[PDB]
Amino acid sequence: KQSHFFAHLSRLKLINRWPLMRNVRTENVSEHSLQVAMVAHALAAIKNRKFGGNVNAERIALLAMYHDASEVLTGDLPTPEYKAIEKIAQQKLVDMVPEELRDIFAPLIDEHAYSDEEKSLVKQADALCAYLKCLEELAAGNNEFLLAKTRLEATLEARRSQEMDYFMEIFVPSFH
Amino acid sequence: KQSHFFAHLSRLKLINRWPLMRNVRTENVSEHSLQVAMVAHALAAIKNRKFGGNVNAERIALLAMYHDASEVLTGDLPTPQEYKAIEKIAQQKLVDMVPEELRDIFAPLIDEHAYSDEEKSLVKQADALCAYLKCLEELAAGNNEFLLAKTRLEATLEARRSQEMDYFMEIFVPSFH
């Protein structure tokens, strides 16, 4: 009868990111995830408004909100077959959803269920938010994020798009 | 041409909730908004799935995400009403920061203006639930400062009672210990 799904989701805030480093401010996955939802929805809106897109931006936000949800079960594995830790964790999380509601939540949690465009937008937003964390940490005189900023920059180019270009041009200078 | 909008949104994680009590763990507005969006979405999908709903559950999530956004300009004012006009002012300040070409997208998310009545009701249900869930968390960690808030959030929840909330409470809420 009773599901522990939301009980586990409530632990996202407990999972800390960037653990191999001194952080001026510790960022948890719940915070990261809201920021990614917000950036991803903006990328989607921009693509629709300016670059011919036909994206469900509200849907994109919701995917972004759940994208790192399995980490309540695994913790954060920092990136310098673990896609298999992740797949298992996502399934175990989806298995907690009552059967009659599970088809709602499965494509939110399971990244393999994302269309190629949805996953592109979500991963653009994730890299920008990671990059933006690097700038905030830099701006507060923390040089430990120098390296991370440089590879994030390689990632950002790899995931380059018109909507990212716009975002970077218009909203990112303000983070200095 | 450069907007400070997202630079200000980034600050939501700096704003702390329940300021007048000792918290076992301090909850920020970013952590709250996410949990509200998750709850709001679930209350919308449940209504749709089991109780004859026709709501856009993704729209509802988005709104929930932005419901407290203006608090990056005002901070958090605990629950006691000209303070509504002041929140109205902070919102429009935030809206004014959006590039003109996107402002019609963002304006309705920040101001309680888009909101259809069912849509505003689901977000408020979710906000009350998440306030209540936090009271449960603190009580179960040994913190009696939250009893009183619990008692008054239960009256708020009765007042906002719905079928989909009844479902949520019965299935998902006892597990928070």
Curated annotation (Swiss-Prot), chain A:
Cofactor note text: A divalent metal cation. Highest activity with Co(2+), followed by Mn(2+) and Cu(2+).
Family statement: Belongs to the 5DNU family.
Keywords tagged on the record: Cobalt, Copper, Cytoplasm, Hydrolase, Manganese, Metal-binding, Nucleotide-binding
Effect of E111A: Shows reduced activity and affinity compared to the wild-type
Record GO cellular component, one term: cytoplasm
Function: Essential component of the deoxycytidine triphosphate (dCTP) pathway for de novo synthesis of thymidylate. Catalyzes the strictly specific dephosphorylation of 2'-deoxyribonucleoside 5'-monophosphates (dAMP, dGMP, dTMP, dUMP, dIMP and dCMP) and does not dephosphorylate 5'-ribonucleotides or ribonucleoside 3'-monophosphates.
CDD domains: HDc
One GO MF term: nucleotide binding
InterPro entries associated with the record: HD/PDEase_dom (IPR003607), HD_domain (IPR006674), YfbR (IPR022971), YfbR/HDDC2 (IPR039356)
Assembly information from the UniProt record: Homodimer.
Predominant location: cytoplasm
Primary gene name: yfbR
Site residues, Appears to be important in orienting the phosphate for catalysis: R17
Cofactor(s) for this UniProt protein: Co(2+); Mn(2+); Cu(2+)
Annotated Co(2+) binding sites: H32, H67, D68, D126
Protein name: 5'-deoxynucleotidase YfbR
Record note on pH: Optimum pH is 8.0.
NCBIfam families listed in its UniProt record: PRK03826.1
GO annotation (BP), single: pyrimidine deoxyribonucleotide salvage
Domain named HD: residues: 29-131
Lineage, top ranks: Bacteria, Pseudomonadati, Pseudomonadota, Gammaproteobacteria, Enterobacterales
